[PDB]
Amino acid sequence: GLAAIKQEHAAIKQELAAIKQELAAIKQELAAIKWEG
Amino acid sequence: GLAAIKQEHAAIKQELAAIKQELAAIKQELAAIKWEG
Amino acid sequence: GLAAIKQEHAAIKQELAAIKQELAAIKQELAAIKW
Amino acid sequence: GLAAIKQEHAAIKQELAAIKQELAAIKQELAAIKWEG
Ligand SMILES: [Cu+2]
Helix, strand or coil: CHHHHHHHHHHHHHHHHHHHHHHHHHHHHHHHHHCCC | CHHHHHHHHHHHHHHHHHHHHHHHHHHHHHHHCCCCC | CHHHHHHHHHHHHHHHHHHHHHHHHHHHHHHHHCC | CHHHHHHHHHHHHHHHHHHHHHHHHHHHHHHHHHHHC
């Protein structure tokens, strides 16, 4: 069970990484938008 | 015990998946307001 | 140990709730930009 | 095992706090774009 919990935490870590990649993509769009106001 | 921890991890993972989907939708909406597509 | 894990998981859940509140606020600003 | 689990929970909490702060920054940036046109 200690290894099982560590694996579940690793899965959560991967989803946090995917969220960080979406945040970066949003910031990229905001930078483009900022030129156009 | 161990089973209840595993359930809480499943709920956390599911919520992170939903947050990720919402961020992807926000990114698409932002991209669409730019002058060039 | 089990109570500590439960408390840590409750704190994580509360932060997820706060994140959903910020998402709603982002959506409000974007809707204002497009209104 | 208990110390390792606590450390990973602290990492998850810290990642979520950082995600929340990035979202607050995105919200504030969008508000600036809203005001300036
Ligand atoms: Cu956990």
